[PDB]
Amino acid sequence: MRHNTAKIAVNIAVREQIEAGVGAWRLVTDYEDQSPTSNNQVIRREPI
Amino acid sequence: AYYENPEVPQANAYMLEAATSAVKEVATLGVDTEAVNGGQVAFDTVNQ
């Protein structure tokens, strides 16, 4: 969650929560070798 | 009978009040901490 796309996903969700009353975030699967957790495979939080 | 000074419509005066107030709303971003990091947290968060 070092990548800013995780932090931005929360910031987007709370913004649309105030405005239209609906916001959200998801979780995806990708490969990171620039921040591996185990097996050079990580999960990432994408914004909606 | 003598000339009487130009009054200027009441419409000009009433519209001036709406002109100054229109700018005054958006001049304030909200205050949550005095000076720095008031309503400008939303600007500053995406910068970092």
Method: cryo-EM
Does residue A16 contact residue A22 with C-beta atoms inside 8 Å?
A: yes
Q: Which residues of B touch A17 (CB under 8 A)?
A: none
Give the torsion sign (CA, A30, A34, A38, A44): negative
| C-alpha span between B48 and B32 (Å, rounded) | 19
Q: How many CA atoms lie within 13 A of A8 on its CB side?
A: 11
B46 and chain A in contact, CB less than 8 A: yes
Q: Which residues of A touch B46 (CB under 8 A)?
A: 8, 11
Q: Which residues of B touch A11 (CB under 8 A)?
A: 45-46
Give the three-state DSSP class for A5.
helix
Q: Which residues 15-44 of B have a C-beta within 8 angstroms of A? A: 42
> Å resolution of this model?
10.5
